[PDB]
Amino acid sequence: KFPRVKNWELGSITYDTLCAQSQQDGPCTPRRCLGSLMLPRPAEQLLSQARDFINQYYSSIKRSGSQAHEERLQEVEAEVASTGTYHLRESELVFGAKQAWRNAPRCVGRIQWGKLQVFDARDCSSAQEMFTYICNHIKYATNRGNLRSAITVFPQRAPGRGDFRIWNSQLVRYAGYRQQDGSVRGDPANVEITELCIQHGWTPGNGRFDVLPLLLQAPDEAPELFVLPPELVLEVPLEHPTLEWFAALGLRWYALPAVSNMLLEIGGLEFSAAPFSGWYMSTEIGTRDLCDPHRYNILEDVAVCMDLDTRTTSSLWKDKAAVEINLAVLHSFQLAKVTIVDHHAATVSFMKHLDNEQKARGGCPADWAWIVPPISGSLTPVFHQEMVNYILSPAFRYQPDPW
Amino acid sequence: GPKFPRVKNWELGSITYDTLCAQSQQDGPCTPRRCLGSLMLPPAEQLLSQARDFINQYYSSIKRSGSQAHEERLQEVEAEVASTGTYHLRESELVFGAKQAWRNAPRCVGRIQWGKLQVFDARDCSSAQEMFTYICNHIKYATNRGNLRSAITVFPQRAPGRGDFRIWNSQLVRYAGYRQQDGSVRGDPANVEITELCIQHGWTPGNGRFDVLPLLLQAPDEAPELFVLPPELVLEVPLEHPTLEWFAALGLRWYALPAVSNMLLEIGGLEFSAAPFSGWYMSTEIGTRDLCDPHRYNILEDVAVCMDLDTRTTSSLWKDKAAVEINLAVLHSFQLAKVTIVDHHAATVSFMKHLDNEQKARGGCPADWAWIVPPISGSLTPVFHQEMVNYILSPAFRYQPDPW
Ligand code: HEM
Ligand code: HEM
Ligand SMILES: Cc1cc(N)nc(CCc2cc(N)cc(CCc3cc(C)cc(N)n3)c2)c1
Ligand SMILES: Cc1cc(N)nc(CCc2cc(N)cc(CCc3cc(C)cc(N)n3)c2)c1
Ligand SMILES: C[C@H](O)[C@H](O)[C@H]1CNc2nc(N)[nH]c(=O)c2N1
């Protein structure tokens, strides 16, 4: 009923009682576990999610059962009954966005959950306005290299109409241009979005690190194209502390990781555009973005530069090259004074987070496969820690692509 | 789409559907409400039903399903159980069942080799001395002077109110771990308990970092007996590095033969409590886990110091650099000594081949993602980008409680 959770390095045990608060089903059944899959395959229900959430909020400010709490429940009941929906107060939105981050099982960065700047953009009525808000978000979060976590929340989904959406998967992404002979120039993960940007009238570049425009969509309208001013997009040229040829690879990455395709669910309400951003963990760039074979795929090139023996896997050329690239990422961000965290530091701070949440809430939802870094897994404390995954609300969810 | 889990590979963009999971007769630990896949640990006519199912599986695998021989074997099994409460496997049924328990093991990346397993039948064994003889022959065959061969030895099955055959060691070859006066451990900390049990049963202990443990072997309703493995039978590999000359001076070594001795082999409801099985190593098991786990030999710092890394800051990636060199030392030294070993790249490539074989042969393959993905360079291997369905099929290897 309540899972026993063991750490195998330390021998310590806890019990997860928080999981009893889950009201949504994940993908697993007793017959089979689907925990390694990336994606999933009336008024009285909105009302009961709304009550839960308002109960969560008054409990958080230590005012459960108070006058303010009781009247807010009534405001919500009256509004749903008359209209089929309701609206959040700004402070409730602020609390709900922090909770959705806190509740995100795939995020190793949750020790920071309390420190989140929330921009209320729910008075947005046009793609133009979305663009201004997003530029403000980026300027704030970037902070000249001293990165600050942020989320901008555009207007909620409504029964009668289309969604506000950002078509891009992140605010900052490099173009992937499909070539004559089916090779890719740039980031292969962004081929389709690059093609959508072009067909909506973007004049494309022809480099490996061409920052994409945004496609922003106000309800029931064609998406609109907005070029991000180059001065807003902070980037870090990649070089290596001792390998001098490395800088000649012309490699670079952007400071700001900002997710823009996820849906923020709070108290039954859905925010289909609510982009959020923090700072990078070095392995996201050094290992996945640069070394994935279906991404920039630079491993072999680096290994050859290092004069390694590329003909046999057993020389561990791939491992040796991957470490140096992750090292180049860390050194380069440090040198350019741009916030970054390495995978050892991040995972140690996640273990602390696990302990804080154990005392605070009797548990912490975590997806082991996503928490464990993609190199040096067992060299991190999290490798050795059992984890319970489940869905709490407020939540960030996946949603279908708008096109 | 199909009413079965859809499974994607994100590197290649390819899709399969797992139909094999429908044949799972046993619940794992997950529910719709929470996933517990990262956790290391979880008969009147219930036996008949498991036996019938296994016999159906055997008759399928030889293509005699629905035949007269198939129906007669069924009848023979229920009659035996009807009159004695248990039944017994034919030789060829044991061989099939043992290979299928390996095939079915969600945590094993070596499964491409599953059809190639020497099965030693030791169901006539009646004493601890004879268990020892059997085990020694297994070790000789399996080791084959460095050209390793997968093998399993199967001792008599659990019987109605009669003691189990048990091997007390979790592996046939393990290094002692000696609890020191200052709280620390000399040798392998994983093995402090079994080490202290061996002494308690009369072993005279060494005091080294790599003392091979004796076996504690238990025949039915008898105290376990202690058996020292003849040293010439236990092939070890001293560890050296290909370019770092000082690495040899560290005096590290590991044994050639990984052989699990504490797992239960269940076949058709029959339970083989002593059934040691063995293969060859994947290099990360030694150079990443056994040598670098903090709660194991823990040599990362020492190696990083020799390599002159900055061990005072995480962001120098000293741990990552030392671990790569240790894994390379393990591969290099096994190669030089001509002892079969597989690195984590080759192993994982071969496991993807296996997945594609099993998709065609059976419609899926149970796989535990967290165990299959290697402990270093995870996303550098193809298995990282491959979704996996995990579920229990039988025949199976299972954990069982310690005999003490
Ligand atoms: C402050 C620094 C932060 C760090 C170092 C960090 C770290 C990470 C990392 C490494 C991932 C895995 C990314 C991947 O493999 O694609 C991730 C996932 C995620 N994080 Fe964070 N995070 C930070 C801030 C935030 C913030 C502010 C939020 C939201 C308010 C957030 C919410 C999420 C969500 C929803 C996911 C899952 C993304 C998905 O499913 O695709 N994180 N986090
Ligand atoms: C041929 C070479 C083989 C290789 C390279 C190999 C590889 C591995 C590896 C790397 C693991 C993970 C173990 C750990 O981290 O503790 C493992 C687990 C396992 N393998 Fe294999 N294997 C091989 C042969 C065998 C054989 C012959 C059997 C049985 C007949 C077997 C059955 C198992 C089982 C049951 C586990 C899970 C053990 C547990 O849950 O504690 N493998 N294998
Ligand atoms: C098919 C598919 C759909 C979907 N929605 N998401 C994915 C993978 C998720 C993901 C992919 C990338 N490239 C980057 C991030 C930013 C991760 C991040 C966020 C923050 C806020 C900080 C940080 N360090 N990293 C997340 C795949
Ligand atoms: C003490 C203990 C008890 C228990 N119930 N479970 C475990 C974890 C499993 C395990 C642990 C270790 N150290 C070694 C192996 C050999 C794995 C192996 C086997 C074969 C046959 C080949 C190979 N390459 N590796 C398996 C440990
Ligand atoms: C199939 C597998 O679940 C998939 O490759 C996951 C593994 N772990 C991950 N972990 C993180 N942090 N990000 C990822 O994209 C993935 N990919």
Ligand SMILES: C[C@H](O)[C@H](O)[C@H]1CNc2nc(N)[nH]c(=O)c2N1
């Ligand atoms: C907590 C987690 O379940 C545990 O540490 C697992 C992770 N993956 C593993 N993978 C393998 N192959 N072997 C292991 O012992 C483990 N340990």
Ligand SMILES: [Zn+2]
């Ligand atoms: Zn699961």
